[model samples]
Target: RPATILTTQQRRAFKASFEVSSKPCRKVRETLAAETGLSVRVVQVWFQNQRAKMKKLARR
Candidate 1:
């Protein structure tokens, strides 16, 4: 159930954008959606999933 609108380059770009953007999801989503072509909801979801993955990795 994944959206196929983004490429690997785009994904990396979004992640890099997050590093410089605000910590809040709402603001981050807006900034990413404006900077990249991905939707705000998609950015939010990506951030959510990525954070969860990071936590899981930290527990290892």
Candidate 2:
């Protein structure tokens, strides 16, 4: 299946949490996933991508 697309609300929540901790624990991921109605894997991928974006920006 294709990856899940995050809604605006979900994106906002993810970004908020990301700022607090770029790499959250599994428990936190589970809670965030539950709150956002997303799978844990999706949340994990989102954080991975977010961190990569941050790294790319830092490199420039």
Candidate 3:
């Protein structure tokens, strides 16, 4: 099956949280996942990918 797409609000919220702290602790990540109705793994990967993306941008 195709992946579940995050809504604009979810995207915005996640991005906002990322700006505050890219490396949030597990408990904090879990809390964010629960609040966003997404799994902890997904949230973790999102942050990881975001950090990598940020690094790639900085390298340019």
Candidate 4:
């Protein structure tokens, strides 16, 4: 099966999870995986990509 692309909703939900859970990758991934039904690795990778993207944007 093809990889599931995370939508804006997933992104928002994941970030929110970080806010309350105060967990970095592991807990964030766990919460996102539980709430969004995504795999843990995918959640971790997504977070890496998301943070990198925002960092790059901030450099502008």
Candidate 5:
């Protein structure tokens, strides 16, 4: 199945947390998943992708 897209509010929350710390612990991912009504795996992947995005930008 295709991944479920995150809502605007969920993205906002994730971005805010990412700005503070790109690499968060398991507990943090769990908390974010709970608060955003998403699965822990999704939150994990989001962070991974966000980190990749930053890395790509930094390389430019």
Candidate 6:
């Protein structure tokens, strides 16, 4: 299935959290999921993708 679209608020929250720690454990993921109304898996994937994006940008 295609991923759900994130609202601007969710994106801002995700980015702030991601800046603190890209590798969030289960508890943190759960907290983020609750805060953003996203599934834990989705939050996990977003952080992972953000990490990859930052890495690629740094190399340029």
Q: What lDDT is reached at residue 5 by model 6? A: 94
Flag the better candidate by TM-score, 3 or 5: 5
What root-mean-square deviation over C-alphas does model 1 reach? Answer: 2.7
Off by over 4 Å in 3: none
TM-score of each: 0.70, 0.95, 0.88, 0.67, 0.94, 0.90
Model 6 misplacement above 4 A: none
Q: Give model 2's TM-score versus the native structure.
A: 0.95
Local accuracy of candidate 2 as per-residue lDDT tens digits, 1-60: 986888999999999999999999999999999999999999999999999999999997
lDDT of 4 by residue, 5-50 (tens): 7788887887786556433657556766888878888787766776
Please give me the total number of clashing residue pairs in predicted model 5.
Answer: 0
lDDT (0-100) at residue 1 of candidate 6? 84
With a 3 Å backbone cut-off (N, CA, C), the pairs that clash in candidate 1 are none
In model 3, the clashing pairs are: none
Best candidate (score: TM-score): 2
Rate residue 35 of model 1 by lDDT: 72
**Residue 53, candidate 1: C-alpha displacement in angstroms:** 0.6
| Candidate 3: tens digits of C-alpha lDDT, residues 1-60 | 467589988788789999899998999888888889998888898999899999999997
lDDT string, candidate 1, 1-60, tens digits: 576577888788767865764254686678778877878777887777777777788997
Model 2 Cα RMSD, 1 decimal: 0.6
Which portions of model 4 show Cα errors greater than 4 Å?
18-23
Residue 40 accuracy (lDDT) in model 1:
79
| Candidate 2 Cα outliers beyond 4 Å, as residue runs | none
Task: Kindly report which residue stretches of model 5 are placed more than 4 angstroms away from their true locations once superposed.
Answer: none
Better candidate number, 3 or 6, judged by lDDT? 6
Writing each residue's lDDT as its tens digit, candidate 5 over 1-58 gives 7878888999999999999999989999999999999999999999999999999999
- Score each candidate by Cα lDDT: 0.72, 0.95, 0.89, 0.73, 0.94, 0.91
